[PDB]
Design a protein around this ligand. Structure first.
Ligand code: PLA
Ligand code: PLA
Lengths: 396, 396
């Protein structure tokens, strides 16, 4: 019954992984996937984490099942990370958080929830976009259509075009926004541009679904949740699929949350009970480690304090690597002015390199970008910036 | 948009748990969920586990993403756990393992794979069965019909009504077997009976799906994989959804696997590549901790040795809790003969108690069993073995 099965095509992002872990060449550089790297090119375990792990280690008396939605204070700490301490969504008890296996697993369960207790049929995810939004949504029933986003010619956010294409969505449709650090492109909207969409989506009756996987990597933390917070004030319902894989360097422990906001307690209560059932039929309850760790660090002022410093380093290690990239680009003799790279936010940068350029790089040169020409700045190092900038500069 | 959403019914199993927590009566007992307990009544973190967590804390330099299918060694170790040291599925490369969030996640990943890469439209689960087999498959699309199993007058399993009801399953249908420790009831097929079913499904053209979540709790790790092995000898394609949450006491860390065996390497490879695609859109990759542990303990002969002893203890304590349950019952005032509780295997016993009886217990004596009258033996201790057995007897 399997004789018939087609060999699925390689994941555009996770394929590189293997493709790299096989290029036997010496100075092979991996600019693919979006995982941090320090000056040495390692993705280390955060210090606050190590400490939270020490604590747990000695303070854990059991491994007995979490709840369907996970660790309570993990949710509460998550909400305040999202909305903000005082916050009426919190003070009115409108939000309900389930802890999930990844921000990628927060998306799916929102989806399976939506497509099964809701009237939706379509979900709108920008162009371009993180290629797995499509797949997690189709896997749920839902069909995905695109809205205009990026002005490629001039490397920015084509707002008119964004707005005009959204106007063709229907009331009751779910429209997906990235909270900050647009993947790829890293072009995000201004606070102003965020309020507008907030107001529009209220008039047009769309249901905003936020993919929030990089709080803290562009600007700040309570500053990354700004757009998200402009919608919350206006709307009556929303869904945030949060992730703590990057900002807590917890990639393989799988930590994220699915926040469901509704008009009121009893409703969100009632709705949330369905979301729970949707998870129960997926993975049952969430993996305790990574979240026990995040709640601990966020629960403890010493650790939390350490943690915010550790993240503020990661962030700035990047803002730096942006500059150095363009600068070495020029001094190494490029034509295309790449100054736009500095305008972007997060681990990536839409390079503007042809698909066949990015193919030559992986072959003539060992350099590994995503086929969109997306490069992980956070994997560029003062030591590899030179061999890299020569490759890139040798294929233009 | 959520205004219309209906509140989901509480999980028959997982909602007893909320029921029990909110219960204020002091001498309250909880035979609900299937989580192991010790003489004192705690769900301790096994020793070899703390020892491995210590190794990890020390030796792990990173949190970087595991691959879609997770940790290799975990996989290779799981296969010898299921199949054998040098079983032909292993030396032939017929099998491929994916690390998944729990055994309820290996089940779902399989359902999504089947209902998308095969023609399967229905899955046959026994009567009775763990109530989430349905909810899981139905979420994949698949329809579940149900085969006879439990002969309730004589608390045995009539192979006949089981065979007969199955004769109706078509060829290309999925048949779901419990590797050992049937849930609930705890009745299992002899080896003879297992090979007869091995052969049957070989003729009738079924694709057996095995839910293996209690390896080691009936007789032993090998004596418990006999059925799965009689099958494995005969079939060309198989799917095993194994779990490590009980026998490694790793409940909230979510550790299990989805093993995919097919006729040859290229097939399984091809098939598996699509099973990977199905995981990529659920949770993306699996949570590292508990799998890291299991790999660690399983690939370290000392730790292994500790582990096997800790498992042998659990297993025997329950065995001890069974007869003590009979005997006490047996002369704490009972009339109904429950000696069959001893025939059963694993954490639970199918008490054959009126679902109105199981209501009186919980409401009049704080004793908590599931509405089927499934009681958790591994939650019975010498200390509560008397008030419990006094409750039962008051309501029968
Ligand atoms: C925009 C975006 N949203 C959500 C997720 C979900 O992440 P999580 O399950 O790991 O929480 C990612 C991860 N995407 C990465 C960083 C890796 C990937 O390809 O999955 C990326 O390279 O874009 C992401 O990039
Ligand atoms: C028959 C059966 N299959 C698979 C699983 C999956 O467990 P995992 O995801 O945790 O690996 C369980 C757990 N079922 C329990 C022990 C608990 C539950 O209801 O979830 C039960 O009480 O039967 C099980 O009982």
């Amino acid at each position: 019954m399997f004789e018939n099965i087609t060999a699925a095509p390689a994941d555009p992002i996770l394929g590189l992984a293997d493709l790299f872990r096989a290029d036997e060449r010496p100075g092979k550089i991996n600019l693919g996937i979006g995982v941090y790297k320090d000056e040495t090119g390692k993705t280390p375990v955060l210090t606050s984490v190590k400490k939270a792990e020490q604590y747990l280690l000695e303070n854990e008396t059991t491994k007995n099942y979490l709840g369907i939605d996970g660790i309570p204070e993990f949710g509460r700490c998550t909400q305040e990370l999202l909305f903000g301490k005082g916050s009426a969504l919190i003070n009115d008890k409108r939000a309900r958080t389930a802890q999930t296996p990844g921000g990628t697993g927060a998306l799916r369960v929102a989806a399976d929830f939506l497509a099964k207790n809701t009237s939706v049929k379509r979900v709108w995810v920008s162009n371009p976009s993180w290629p797995n939004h499509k797949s997690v949504f189709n896997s749920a029933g839902l069909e995905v259509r695109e809205y205009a986003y990026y002005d490629a010619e001039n490397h920015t956010l084509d707002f008119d075009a964004l707005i005009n294409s959204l106007n063709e969505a229907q009331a009751g449709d779910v429209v997906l926004f990235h909270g900050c650090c647009h993947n790829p492109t890293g072009i995000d909207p201004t606070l102003e541009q965020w309020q507008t969409l907030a107001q529009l989506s209220v008039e047009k009756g769309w249901l905003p679904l936020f993919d929030f996987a990089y709080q803290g990597f562009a600007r700040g933390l309570e500053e990354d949740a700004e757009g998200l917070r402009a919608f919350a004030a206006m709307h009556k319902e929303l869904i945030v699929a949060s992730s703590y894989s990057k900002n807590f360097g917890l990639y393989n422990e799988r930590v994220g949350a699915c926040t469901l906001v509704a008009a009121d307690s009893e409703t969100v209560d009632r709705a949330f009970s369905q979301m729970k059932a949707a998870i129960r039929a997926n993975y049952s309850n969430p993996p305790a480690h990574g979240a026990s760790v995040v709640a601990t660090i966020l629960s403890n002022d010493a650790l939390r304090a350490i943690w915010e410093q550790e993240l503020t380093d990661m962030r700035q290690r990047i803002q730096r690597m942006r500059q150095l990239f363009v600068n070495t680009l020029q001094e190494k003799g490029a034509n295309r002015d790449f100054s736009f790279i500095i305008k972007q936010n997060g681990m990536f940068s839409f390079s503007g390199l042809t698909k066949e350029q990015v193919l030559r790089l992986r072959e003539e040169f060992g350099v590994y970008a995503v086929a969109s020409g997306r490069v992980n700045v956070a994997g560029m190092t003062p030591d590899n910036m030179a061999p890299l900038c020569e490759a890139i500069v040798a294929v233009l």
